[model samples]
Target: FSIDDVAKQAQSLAGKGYETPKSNLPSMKYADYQQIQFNHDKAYWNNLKTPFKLEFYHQGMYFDTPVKINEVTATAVKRIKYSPDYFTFGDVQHDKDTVKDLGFAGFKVLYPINSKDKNDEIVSMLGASYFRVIGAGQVYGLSARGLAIDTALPSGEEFPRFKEFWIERPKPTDKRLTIYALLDSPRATGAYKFVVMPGRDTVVDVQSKIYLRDKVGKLGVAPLTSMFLFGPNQPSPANNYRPELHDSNGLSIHAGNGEWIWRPLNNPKHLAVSSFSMENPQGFGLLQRGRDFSRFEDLDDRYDLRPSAWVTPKGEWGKGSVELVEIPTNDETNDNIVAYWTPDQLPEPGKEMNFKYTITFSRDEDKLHAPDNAWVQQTRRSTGDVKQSNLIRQPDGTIAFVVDFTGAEMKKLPEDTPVTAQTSIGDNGEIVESTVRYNPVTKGWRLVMRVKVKDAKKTTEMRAALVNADQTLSETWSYQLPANEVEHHH
Candidate 1:
């Protein structure tokens, strides 16, 4: 059937609403761990069945409630029967010889996103309520969750599972895929629809309507999870060969009123949670800014190939904040950075919440970068040192910050142009030295400053950005310095 047919079927399901299903099986050791072996069943997965196919994860492991997947047609909604014997586990040789009922953990979307041969971009797996989309010449770095509840709260976090889904069958000539998910947790349950179109800028149009089951302390909308072990903002390892390592480097927020803020990510020594409150937020994202291969120098990981995930809110999300949570991680494997939206009004049970947004998974500026005059190209911080000592000890306990900007506007201005840096610090800190200069090396303007921490026991907040007499030249740079915390061991 066509997309219109699927839309009609989806509307019908919405009218009928949804319900949770019951699961029956032996108590698996894992909360959600049911493994079924897959035999080389010709009907299951063969080259000729479909162009690129998907494999389903059984209902087990962290997945107990089975999410019913249905194919909506013009006539009616047909439920796709899920059986356990569709998966392969244990030894490949042994598993291929027999069949068992494993149900489904989840399903993977297969399509050729990389190679010219239609089979090259086979991407599978949408586990939990998370689906990954990639463009050509891109590496899967950050993942966007369907919903996040009380993510950094003392009460603990909640993991929402997709209890049901409606997948629209694609035509042989279709180049994209569409899937809808019904997410449920102790706090909330939601209906999500995703229209995934792959390209240089892989776009996913997301429409979701959620009903709160219980009062939620913090409901994070459009949350993105990524790893930030070390990057240009922080020093790299001495023994490691790469100059930097990270899936994303910064957080970009676009306020409803058109203010763009960039908060660089940090691998902090302790847990850090930062929020930028806004009346109505337009968008926000976890950006991989340092795209140069030389910045990373890792041929295998290819941090440069990581895509930047940008969220553009569909309507007015009045009075909320963009929250960034940076957790301490000793290794690169663990994701330490999380960014999401916290609406001003908390949802209560029996209340339905609806939000529409679009996420662009792209490597080029056409999808993520905003058109503006001057933009921040780099931001670096170091100790205020002099010739006598590489590290200058300040009685006030101050650290130096250096920011660089490059663009058409900044480039056209003369070196002696009166470009200024508006720098400020919270009560815990004070700005000592702040100046702007034109760098001949990169043909850009640089903002340099030093901040003094009044107290070594608390965190100091600071904000700085370039500006001219009439308007702001660059996006706001926000940083949080944890006093008494030792810098990375370079």
Candidate 2:
């Protein structure tokens, strides 16, 4: 079936009460779930003359929700039923007769991304309404959810799940693949169409229509989930070898007014929420800017090889805000960062909301989509006070920041150019000193600032950038200082 058919089904489903799907198989522990694996030899269209191959996931453990899958052809659609022979249970013993017609949890798409002869698992849609994609020579890092309702709200959040999917078969010569999905939740239903194109920088074009059965407190469109346990700005609390650990480092936004804003992500001590007001926003996403392997210092996780996902608006998204929610996490396994756009007006009951956007999973530096002007390369925080003589002075709740700005515009300026630093602090803090100097090693400009906050129990919002004769030389470096003293070791 096509997207229209799915939309009709979603609309009809919204009219009725939500019914939770039942697990056909008994619940299994995490260890047993890992033993249940899909045999690669039984992959759909494995030996056929097609560009894509589909592999299913067995339903058990945490992923108990079963989803119906269909293969669409030019003229007809065929439902892919589950069979006990499709999966090979390794160490976990189960009776073949006990589980019958237990549908799949989700599926993965395989394509020749890294090599022409070897098909790599490029994208997978599993768990709730979340999915992950990777480009050539990159590993999966962040995930994109179908929808988020009332995220970070006091009333708690609601997760929407994809109840079914219809994947269109592609010819051997075809370069693009299309997939349609039907989403359901307690308060809303949605139909989504994705056209995926794989390459060095894989891109997925998404079109969604959501029908709300009831009013939602917040509707987060194209939401992204990532992990940011610690980074240069906020070092790791525990002793570790790696300099930084995170899937994404900051939230990059291209404002509707043609201005660019960069807000560094933080693993705050408490739940934190920030928003950027906009009208017809151009684009926004969580970005992993650090590409050097030495920065991560890990060979297993390979954090430096993780791809960044950028969301570009396909049409005008009017009167909304790009909201970022940061939750505290002690480890990297937990996804503590979320960013999405929320419309100013909420959808009424029985009303339909439509949104279209493109998500690009890329590791190429040129595909970051940053502005041509200068941008922040790194941000480091330290104590404001330093030792001078025999006597040592204690820090008086003051923090020192060092930011590096690098780009084509930054390199064009002469070494002797009079570049100055512009900075501002909220009522909770006061800027003590700020300076800008050219760095010979980076061939760019470096900005250093010292600020003292009045109250140690309150969070402080700060902004700084480099300027040359009143003309802005870099994108605004936006940051937040959490309440209480931030630990930093030299």
Candidate 3:
């Protein structure tokens, strides 16, 4: 059956107190396998003759527990059994090959979302209940997780797996597809339904009903994973060819109270965790706000194509927190930023919880409009003497901050109008000097400041912006600065 079937079944099973089914797949050798493989050639996939083509993954890497795939047709849902002939093996095409015994890890949809003649295939569904979707000209950056358990915990992480999936048969003119998954873990079991519609903004409407077998410490909903190597907020070490390298640059949140918070992502030396509590969050997302190719300078990776995944709750979520976890990584390959919503209450054993939301993968700024008159377009940091002094010890360590602001309100104001710099530093630092300049290059205003960190061994959080006639005129520039490394040259 499909996910809807599983949801109904899970609700009934929860009433009767269900337990996670134990896996007989040998607990020793293949337990750590999670790697997935795409086994079909382009011709076979293209010739599927469906509006959406299917690409399969070879299970057994991290997906030791096999999940069954079925088709939910108008008549009924039935299992999709396959033979060795259904697959393509370059050298080992014989039926005796053991690989044929392994079923698919997951499937993706391929359709012409952007153009009538071109197909923007949505590659997704694999091990550990993870999937990713991209729009036309969008690069795969952050990943959406089916569920997260006790993440960032001292105890080992628990990976929830999609034990089964049922894909519905699509019509020739259908532009959207629906897929259902049954999630299994030691703590909980869930039934998930994803209605995927592809376009410039691929939307995945998700509905999940989870039944807990045991109390979970942390149950993350709509979790997203991305990488942050370096950006205007945080600069990487010297000798790197690229100016900035990251899949995403910041976390944007639309709080329940109408406040829009943009917290820039970072590659910290130590693990960093930040949370914003709310009763019912309007939406949240990990954004690649730095869209300019000049910022990244990698033509092949096309960091600019990375789509921002925004999660908007369909109903009241009660009280919860939008949590962000940043981990340290030196390269672009490692995914170091994770963001999700954590509920205030936990689901006890035999209890069920449901959440429904819409996830949009897009580059539409109109859909994600922000208030506060202005927004921080960029943040640049530098270490140098504020004054000219060769061979002179600069008593007050100077760190320069550059912030750019753009908006209708700010842009409408006369460029000559006197603007005051309302800036401050936390206890860890002291604001030495502050100034504002009109950046002729960006056709926007730039807020520049120099702060001297009080403690050489600690980090400081700084806030700055422009004010005119007792009113704030720009998005508050908030930044966290680490201690100066001696390796940095003036």
Per-candidate clashes, comma-separated: 26, 0, 5
The TM-score, computed over Cα atoms with residue i paired to residue i, of candidate 2 is 0.96
Model 2, position 422: C-alpha lDDT score: 77
lDDT by residue (tens digit), candidate 1, 1-490 = 4433433443444344344445543344542233344343522224443444455655544455555677654477787776544555453222322324434556665556766455433233455566666677787788888888998999998777776666766665776667777676766777777888777777888888776766778989988889888765677646677878898888988878787788888887788899898887988998887577998898888889988899999988888889999998999987899999998887556555678999888776423645555666767766753122535454335577788887765677788878888888899877888888899887789888787776767778888878889988777888777545533233
Q: Give the TM-score of candidate 3.
A: 0.86
- Tens-digit per-residue lDDT, 83-145, candidate 2: 767888877655666675477889999898899788788899998899999888988899998
> What is the alpha-carbon lDDT of model 3 when measured against the actual structure?
0.74
Those runs of model 2 whose alpha carbons end farther than 4 Å from true positions after fitting are 386-393, 485-490
lDDT of 3 by residue, 193-266 (tens): 99998878889999998887778788899999998888766677666778888877778887898656667777
List clashing residue pairs in candidate 2.
Answer: none
Error of 2 at 325 (Å): 0.6
**Top model by lDDT, which number?**
2
| lDDT of prediction 1 | 0.71
All candidates: TM-score: 0.85, 0.96, 0.86
Tell me the whole-model lDDT of each prediction, alpha carbons only. 0.71, 0.86, 0.74
